[PDB]
């Protein structure tokens, strides 16, 4: 138990978690565009001129 000074280390291992990327890199999934306003069907001339 003299606890002498040992030599300098050769290198460094570093352990850390890696993320999973099987999900991302996929084609994007955007929010679907709301439709442009379309005229309602069944619009008729309700007003007829008097006389």
């Amino acid at each position: 138990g003299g606890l002498t000074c040992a030599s300098a280390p050769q290198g460094t291992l570093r352990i850390l978690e890696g993320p999973q990327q099987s999900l991302s890199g996929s084609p994007l999934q955007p929010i679907p565009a709301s439709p442009p306003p379309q005229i309602p069907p069944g619009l008729r001339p309700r007003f007829c001129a008097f006389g």
Binding site: L28, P30, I31, P32, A33, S34
Partner: protein, 63 residues
């Protein structure tokens, strides 16, 4: 996702479905008129008005 104010300036959100490009836009807004207030969303057809006339309506809508 909830993004913040400093976080927004490094993101490329898109406004419409057409503006989404792969590898460019990371995010997209919920609906294109989400840049406006509660009160400023009560102005009809506000993208056809001049902008001081929309600023005046937000004031005189409250009077």
């Amino acid at each position: 996702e909830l993004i913040g104010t400093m976080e927004q300036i490094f993101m490329n959100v898109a406004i419409f479905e057409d503006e989404v490009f792969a590898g460019v836009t990371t995010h997209q807004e919920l609906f294109p008129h989400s840049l406006l207030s509660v009160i400023a969303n009560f102005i009809p057809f506000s993208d056809h008005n001049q902008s001081p006339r929309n600023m005046y309506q937000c004031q005189m809508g409250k009077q």
